[PDB]
Structure formats: C-alpha cells, structure tokens
Amino acid sequence: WVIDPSELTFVQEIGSGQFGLVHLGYWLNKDKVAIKTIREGAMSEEDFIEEAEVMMKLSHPKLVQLYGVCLEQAPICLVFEFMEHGCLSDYLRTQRGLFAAETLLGMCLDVCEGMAYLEEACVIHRDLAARNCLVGENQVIKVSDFGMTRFVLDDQYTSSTGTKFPVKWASPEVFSFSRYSSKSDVWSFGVLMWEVFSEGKIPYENRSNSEVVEDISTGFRLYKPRLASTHVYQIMNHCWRERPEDRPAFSRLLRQLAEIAES
Template sequence: MNFNTILEEILIKRSQQKKKTSPLNYKERLFVLTKSVLTYYEGRAEKKYRKGFIDISKIKCVEIVKNDDGVIPCQNKYPFQVVHDANTLYIFAPSPQSRDRWVKKLKEEIKNNNNIMIKYHPKFWADGSYQCCRQTEKLAPGCEKYNLFESSKCSSDSVVVMSEGYIPSNYVTGKKSNNLDQYEWYCRNTNRSKAEQLLRTEDKEGGFMVRDSSQPGLYTVSLYTKFGGEGSSGFRHYHIKETATSPKKYYLAEKHAFGSIPEIIEYHKHNAAGLVTRLRYPVSTKGKNAPTTAGFSYEKWEINPSELTFMRELGSGLFGVVRLGKWRAQYKVAIKAIREGAMCEEDFIEEAKVMMKLTHPKLVQLYGVCTQQKPIYIVTEFMERGCLLNFLRQRQGHFSRDMLLSMCQDVCEGMEYLERNSFIHRDLAARNCLVNEAGVVKVSDFGMARYVLDDQYTSSSGAKFPVKWCPPEVFNYSRFSSKSDVWSFGVLMWEVFTEGRMPFEKNTNYEVVTMVTRGHRLHRPKLASKYLYEVMLRCWQEKPEGRPSFEDLLRTIDELVECEETFGR
C-alpha cells in the first residue's frame, strides 16, 4: 500500500449488466481507494493488472444494498453499491465491518461532489429491473431518499459521516422516519386502528410499536397491556414530544428526555417511568411481505409454472377458480386460473406489463402471469383474510367506527395512487378489495373489468352489471374515468359503514337506474356520522366535475382519522 492509499482489500465485484440480457458473474478483485480514484485489479498486490477504475468526482451515491431474500451467490455476503455516470457497481464485502469501513470512507471522499443523487435504488438491479421498485430502465429515478450523511445500518458499530467528523449512529436524532426504518418496532403508515389490531393479535404484555402520528413529522408509541391500567381496552397511545430547549430532545415522560427516538425506546424497555407498562415486546409488520417477484422467469412479467405449487382453493371469481399457492415452495401467492372464454387474454397479457408497474402498499400486487399453457394463470399477492365484503359480513357488530374509517382510508390511498398514475379501476366495490393478516385493506382487480367477456357483466342491461356502484355516465354512456371511480368509492364507503349490506338491496338494476337518474341516493348508515355521510354525498354528485378527486377525499379522510386520534372514540 502506498502513502496515497486510503483503503485496500480483496472484495468481490459483480458484473455491471450494462445490457438487460447480460449474464451475471462474480469475480475477486483487489480494490484500492485513493483521494482521486477507486481502482480494481485482477491478482494480488505483488502482481496486479488494472481491470477498471472510477473517478471519485463522478461518484453520485455510495450505500449498502438491501437484500431481503438473503440469497448472495458468492462467499462475500455484505453488498454495497457505487453509483457513477450511468452505471452501478455492486461490491461484496466479507463482513459488515468491512462494508461499513468502505461505505464510510467513500462517503467521506465524495461529500463535496456536486452530482450527489437525491434518491437511489436500495436493492439490486437484476433480470432487467430494479428489485425495489420494479422500474425497468437503468437510468430510472431512484425510489428512496439518499442521505449522504447517514451511515449504513447493517452493524452495531456503524457510524454516520458528518461534515465535522464521525459520531455513533445511535446518537443521530430519530426525527426523520428514514432513520427509524431499520428498527423492528417502527411501523410506517400504521394508524391507531391498525396498531390496535396488530397489538391485539400478538396479545403479549408490553407489546408496542412506534408509528407515524396524525401530526406530520411526529411519532406515537402504541402500547398494549393485559394487566392493570385504566379502562378495559388495554391500549395506550403516547405521543413522543419534543423539548422547547436547544438542542431538541424527545420524551414520553418529561423527566426522561433523550437526543433520539431509539434512545427513548431503549430506556423504556427497562423502565415504565410513567407508562402503563415497560416496552417489553416489539410488534412489527416487517418481514411478512410477499417476495420481490419482478423478473421471475422468461420475461419481466412471465412466471415459470413449474415454479408454482398449488394448494387449497380460496374461492372463485369472474374469471375462474382462485387457489392459494407457493412460488418456489417458499412464498405464498394467490393463483387465478383463467376459465376459457372468460376474458380477452391477448389484451390482458399486453396490459399486464403495465399493471405490474403499479406498486403501492394499498394495492394487491400483480406479480406476473403464466401464458405458456392453458389455462393461463394470474399470480398475485396473497391476502390472508380474503374479500372485504365477506370480512365485513362475518364480523358484523365487532367493528368500531374508527376501524371502519381506517378501511376506507386504506382503499382511498390505493385509489389516489391509481388516479395519480392515470389508471381507472372501473369496478371498485367491497367485493374487489382484499384484507391481509394485519387487517390492511388493499384494492384488487384494478382495470380487469376491461377484459371480461361476459355480456351480462359488461352491458348495462345485463343482470350482472354493477349498476348499484355506477354513476349515470357509466350506466348510460359507458364513460369511465377517475371520477366514476370516485362515485363507486362512495358506495364502497356505504358498504363498509353498513358492515356489508347490499346497496339498494330491494331494488332491481332497472329501478336503480331510474332512482339515481331522478336524484335518489343511498340513505345514511347508522354507523356513519353526518359529516361522513356528507363525504359520501360529495362522491355521488350527478356531474363528474362536481365530485372530489381521490387526493381531496384522502385529505378529508385523513382529517377525520386525525380527529378520531386526537379526541378519542
């Protein structure tokens, strides 16, 4: 090592896959970092041949690579990435300490570069797409915020690069949610109702989680106790508060303030200090997600049917039988076998490529299709609790109003994403939403109504046509838009707050068309407040331009949820 060398170590380099079809390989290289260049050599230090180099001034991002599935096809198991020009170099270190050392030193050397990325891709580019967001262009914008002054979070001795030096990462303020994602107890985008469902399901004394508060930028600790405390619910929700002093500190109990949220949690794991019980057992939504499945097989959207295992039947829908299955005997998925003549297959297969790119926590993820045989299969995310309509009907009388409102909020979030991406559902109803193990509701079968070949379902004169969920411009002129989806969402809200009743249950489709055209609307459900019913009525304005957007609806529902959390049930 010469005097200019900052770091030198034998690491493993992955081929850069500059073309989507390029084969992958992994080769040992001697990496040498200096102030001006990162160079890699073939062979040992005493006899080495330079294979490539990266100008330090051209590096845009250095960060660890998240690897949820844990499959690393070489002996070094700790990957990090160096993004430069139009390429990403993936390097594999032999230990977390080695990886931290390289990431820290590289970040220090690039901190004055003027081309640092705002966002990056936290997972690998593989099989022609990024495994984090499934974007299929090498130059696609990143999907997660990149913080140059935040260290890798993979080991206990990680450090954070700061302009004035280095400090242990556990002392960095946990104010931003990005800093909390590494912790098992942090549940992003979980509201009060969902938190209580998760804590009740675990049913463990001192079960807790940290979640986003209804007030943007703040956090709440939700805590469950089986013994003692006021009231019978067993749930307590504590806002994490900030001191007025500088530097800011955070606390649950005013006498015990700390510089970061992780420090608060660590303290209260051992001391109740004013809480109803200690924080004994972290409850999490992490680690329960379905696999990252883009690029399963032949093409980005094509799945090899030999990799699917068929299990029990879940039910049947418009297109055929739906079964629980497993992909590669490991990940649970739902598999729809498409009945011959049930759908326009060619059009759907072409559209599947677009639909797979629609990725949101409140949409049931389409993973891919099997088109190499008949019947074709559609493979999607598996939702443990099934259809929302049945979920409501089977548990009538057991929902609080805020749980019902939370269901509507979930659906609205998914629909706002579809609206933002100019995608129309066309058949939004409780029967076309599914519920997962944690009680999260997700929108399913978006856009699928276009491919139905059943005349009764596609014609407004047909007995199966969902007239009771449709606005006048749809049953009169078949004019679909995001605003027609808004009307359907109003009906779905009505379904939720009646716990699964049929809209206009005593009327035929023909009668409903006449009633709606004359201005008749569904009555206010007993469980819906006057203000909530006004939201439904806004969805049912006769002219599409008079209806709110899903963005407006989501803002309104978020305000209602916030009132619920602020003032109690």
C-alpha cells in the same frame, strides 16, 4: 413477468366463481401466493397479456400486487400477492358488530390511499367495490382488480345495459355511456364507503338494474348507515353528485377523510 408453470404449486382452493378458481399456493423462491385460474372464454387473454407488464409495474402498498402470468399452457393463471383475510365484503359480513366506527373509517382511508395513487397514475378502476378490496395483516385494506373489467368477455357484465352489469357501483355517466374516469371511481368509492359503514350490506338490496338507474336519475341516494357520522355521510354524498365535475378528486377525499379520522 411470465411465470413458468413448474414455478407454481397449488395447495388449497379458497374461492371459485364466474370466471374461475382461486387457490392458495406457492411461487418458487418468492412466497405464498393466491393463484387465479381463468376459465376458457371468460377473458380476452391476448388483450390482458398486452397490458400485463404495465399492470405489474404499478406498485403501491395499498394495491394487491400482480406478480406474474403463467401462460405456457391453457388454462392461464394469474399470480397475486396473498391477502390473509380475504375480501372486505365477506370480512365485514362475518364480523358484523365487531367494528368500531374509527376502524371502519381507517379501512376507507386505506382504500382512498390506493385510489389516490391510481388517480395520479391515470389508472381507472372501473369496478371498485367491497368485494374486490382485500384484507391483509393488521386489518390493512388493499384495492385489487383495477382495470380488469376491460378484459371480461361476457357483454352481460361489461355493457352498461347488460343483465349482469354492476350498476350498484356505477355513476350515471357509466351506466349511461360507459364514460369511465377517476370521478366515476369516486362515485363507486362512495358506495364502497356505504358498504363499509353498513358492515357489508348490499347497496340497493333488491332493486333491479332498471330500478337503480331510475332511482339514481331521480335523485335517490343510499341512506345513512348507523355507524357513519354526520361528517362521514356528508363525504359519501359528495361522491354521489350527479355531475363528475362536482365530485371530489381522490386527492381531496384523502385529505378530507384523514382530517375526519385525525379529529
């Protein structure tokens, strides 16, 4: 699982943000890869290195694969399966108007398949959103970044009261207590379905973190996107039940969404 730096070539930068840079590159005797270089102080590298072997052994066609870690020199690098069409959020936004409702449901089905595998494996994603789903060949969607917020060091992103906390995808028990579970991932999956069927609109656009907490706690829920059928919006609302016990598991969601798609 440890990749020697001499086994990697960096060709072109494809993305950058808070936490680091992503390059298109090549991994010796293997394939084209996406390489993430980590900025110093952005992650607990030691905690990640402890968990890396387990994360790499997780394998499913609907999960973006971690191929290994280049840790011999600072900054460290993480090597991933290259996803030709980038993130789902931008893929939807840039191609708005070019999607059939069936295609959007099929994208949700792909994510649900990956999530049902994580649920069975007792892996909590913690931050499921269209921005971390990736698009491959033939519009296949894969889930990435499951469990990665465990390693983020900026308490403003990880604390439920942090100024950068991703509250838009958080269930009430997550924004209140950081009580993560596959059922809090189900809430996030409902928000992801809304992002997909709204063709990449930002959920609770213009609402502050405090406003999202108050609105959700008082029963507000995201409106029905134009492209979501009655049945699809009913499933979204089931993901947003206040009590995690009342939300469907991903095993149940996978069958429900497949039944809707198959007709």
